Amino acid sequence: HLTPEEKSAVTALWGKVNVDEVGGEALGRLLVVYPWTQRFFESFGDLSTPDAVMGNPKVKAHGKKVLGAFSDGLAHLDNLKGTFATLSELHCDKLHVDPENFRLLGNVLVCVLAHHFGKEFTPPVQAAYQKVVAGVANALAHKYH
Amino acid sequence: HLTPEEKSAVTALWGKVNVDEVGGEALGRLLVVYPWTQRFFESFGDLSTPDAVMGNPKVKAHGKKVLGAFSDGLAHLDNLKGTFATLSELHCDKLHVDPENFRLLGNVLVCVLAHHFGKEFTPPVQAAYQKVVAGVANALAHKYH
Amino acid sequence: LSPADKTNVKAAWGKVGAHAGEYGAEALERMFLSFPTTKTYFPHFDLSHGSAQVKGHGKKVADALTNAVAHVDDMPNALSALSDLHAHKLRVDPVNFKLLSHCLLVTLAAHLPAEFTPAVHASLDKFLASVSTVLTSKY
Amino acid sequence: LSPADKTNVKAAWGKVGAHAGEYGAEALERMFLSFPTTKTYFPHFDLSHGSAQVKGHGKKVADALTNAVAHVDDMPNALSALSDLHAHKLRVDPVNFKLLSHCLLVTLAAHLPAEFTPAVHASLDKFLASVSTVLTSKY
Ligand code: HEM
Ligand code: HEM
Ligand code: HEM
Ligand code: HEM
Numbered sequence: 306h307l308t309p310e311e312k313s314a315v316t317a318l319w320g321k322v323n324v325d326e327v328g329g330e331a332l333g334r335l336l337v338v339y340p341w342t343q344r345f346f347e348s349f350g351d352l353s354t355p356d357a358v359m360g361n362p363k364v365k366a367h368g369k370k371v372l373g374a375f376s377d378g379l380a381h382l383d384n385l386k387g388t389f390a391t392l393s394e395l396h397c398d399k400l401h402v403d404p405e406n407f408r409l410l411g412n413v414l415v416c417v418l419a420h421h422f423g424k425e426f427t428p429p430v431q432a433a434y435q436k437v438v439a440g441v442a443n444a445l446a447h448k449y450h
Numbered sequence: 451h452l453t454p455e456e457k458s459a460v461t462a463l464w465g466k467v468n469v470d471e472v473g474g475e476a477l478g479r480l481l482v483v484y485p486w487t488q489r490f491f492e493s494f495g496d497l498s499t500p501d502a503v504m505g506n507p508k509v510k511a512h513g514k515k516v517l518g519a520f521s522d523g524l525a526h527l528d529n530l531k532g533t534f535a536t537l538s539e540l541h542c543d544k545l546h547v548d549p550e551n552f553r554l555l556g557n558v559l560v561c562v563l564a565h566h567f568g569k570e571f572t573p574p575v576q577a578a579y580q581k582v583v584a585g586v587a588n589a590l591a592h593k594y595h
Numbered sequence: 596l597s598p599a600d601k602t603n604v605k606a607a608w609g610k611v612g613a614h615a616g617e618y619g620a621e622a623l624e625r626m627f628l629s630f631p632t633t634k635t636y637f638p639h640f641d642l643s644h645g646s647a648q649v650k651g652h653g654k655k656v657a658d659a660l661t662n663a664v665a666h667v668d669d670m671p672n673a674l675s676a677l678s679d680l681h682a683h684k685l686r687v688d689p690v691n692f693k694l695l696s697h698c699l700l701v702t703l704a705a706h707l708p709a710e711f712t713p714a715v716h717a718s719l720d721k722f723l724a725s726v727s728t729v730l731t732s733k734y
Numbered sequence: 735l736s737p738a739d740k741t742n743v744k745a746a747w748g749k750v751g752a753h754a755g756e757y758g759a760e761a762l763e764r765m766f767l768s769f770p771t772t773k774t775y776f777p778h779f780d781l782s783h784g785s786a787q788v789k790g791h792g793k794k795v796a797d798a799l800t801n802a803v804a805h806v807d808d809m810p811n812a813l814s815a816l817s818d819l820h821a822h823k824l825r826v827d828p829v830n831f832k833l834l835s836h837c838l839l840v841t842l843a844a845h846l847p848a849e850f851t852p853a854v855h856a857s858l859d860k861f862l863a864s865v866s867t868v869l870t871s872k873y
Contacts, residue, residue: 337855734860
């Protein structure tokens, strides 16, 4: 669903992403900005304030597993339903996460990429990244359909 | 994905549905309850008041065509994506209708079945139909992914 | 809410009266069967058909919506306590309020087919939206 | 809006300043290119990059949000004319206010990295959600 210039721009910026920290700031910002999401992460411990959430080392740890999954999705853009089929089962049948919350995490991920690349995150680059997250959000929502 | 006993309660209630009315009734209520939807239907004429909309002749006539695509969708519950291939193409590429609104006509339809059928419309009968309309809504939004 | 909306709502909710609690139970039951993600907010409840607890809670929802109709013009100070409960303590996902409001509309339809006109359907949707907006204000 | 959220917004909007109209233009561009269904409301506009019309509109949206910051306690009254335009005249799908708010946040993050903290991010979301809600209140 991406052009050849789109796919190239996506892959060029992703290679520059601090795999260690972006994942954590994104899962952190979800829990702060959309606080109903904290009830699925009861056992990560102290999420009582903004500074607790961004300091909490289990949010940071788990944040790496989430960026890990997006990477894996980018590698297989023509077979997302296949790549996320197991995680879709986890989120949908076990955890019972409303698929509107998958859209929110993808949009927080786009805010986080803009915070880090500033001027380099041009409207055409954002617009290719919006296609990707809509792709992933929709692939994780498959077991509801 | 319905069970045998869901499918036979769905199929059994539909064969008593007044096809020449409920369609219009559904479309009419969508246009009154969610007024922004009226911008897609300007050529239909006078939508200024609830009385205008419900008695509009181009609304009732378009209601039959909607309920006519629902009737096709029940036949082929194993292949909705394909049944609605051409309607997804029209609605997403030509008309640019936000998928959030397919869900809204799905739910307005449920309020109307309830309105006509009453107590014969039970909570478990509803949970079957809720499964149907969602699948319809997803099938129609397929060209957006 | 417009003056035409206030009228339609007060008229429609007048003609529920004592049936109010019995209707709330049916709405909750419909929600649980139609949208099984909502069942996890009630681990401490028997969710089986004709449950004592769901009848009892049904009446607590109904009483809340009657006070709202009675205080239609000062809605945020008639429901203030319930936002804190739903938003701060229970962390209820905002999408779930659209699901209950929708099952609430399927119940009033199935029970008051003479008063469930398209103009009344629209007033009650606007009313339940307002109620939802207040309950989610602490977000 | 809470006292903290009000302070946090007046901080962030302060730093924006004379650039508000330029960021207003970027947010519209970002929305047209990312969510191309939104184009259908501007058939009478040249929507190519650096259009005179998108810059001129950027300013109008920017100057309306500045009014709203100045009148945060009386937002319904400050925007009621805009609310009649967007619901009654234009007939804007509510889902679209969410996509413009996202594209404003993406623009601010890219321009104010020092100021775009988790706490300020959360306050700015509440603020644009409050505006979207007034702009859809005739529905
Ligand atoms: C694009 C969206 C998302 C992606 C790519 C994603 C990815 C993942 C991955 C890779 C895991 C680890 C699976 C495993 O350990 O076996 C996971 C676990 C989890 N996810 Fe997500 N997720 C997403 C959205 C969400 C959202 C929105 C929520 C909650 C609101 C959520 C809640 C969880 C929870 C609770 C766990 C399990 C944590 C534990 O108990 O150890 N996910 N997710
Ligand atoms: C969710 C189920 C829906 C179904 C089954 C459905 C079905 C149909 C059908 C069968 C047609 C006629 C196509 C033809 O024969 O040429 C049609 C046309 C149309 N639909 Fe839908 N539709 C749905 C939802 C929506 C929604 C939500 C909107 C707008 C908010 C919409 C807007 C339209 C418009 C504008 C037309 C074109 C009418 C004309 O000008 O000739 N549809 N729909
Ligand atoms: C129109 C919408 C709603 C109204 C008017 C409403 C009203 C109420 C009231 C009055 C109470 C009890 C207050 C008390 O303890 O004295 C309550 C409790 C509760 N509500 Fe709601 N509610 C609404 C929507 C929801 C939704 C959508 C959910 C979940 C999906 C929910 C979950 C709960 C839970 C879990 C409790 C506490 C149960 C317990 O402690 O035993 N509510 N609600
Ligand atoms: C924060 C959200 C928004 C704000 C503050 C805003 C503000 C404004 C303002 C100040 C105007 C000019 C009014 C006038 O000329 O008297 C306007 C016009 C307009 N807005 Fe918005 N708007 C918002 C959201 C939207 C969205 C989401 C859409 C469509 C996707 C939209 C479409 C338009 C259109 C089509 C016009 C008329 C343009 C013309 O004919 O010159 N607005 N808006």
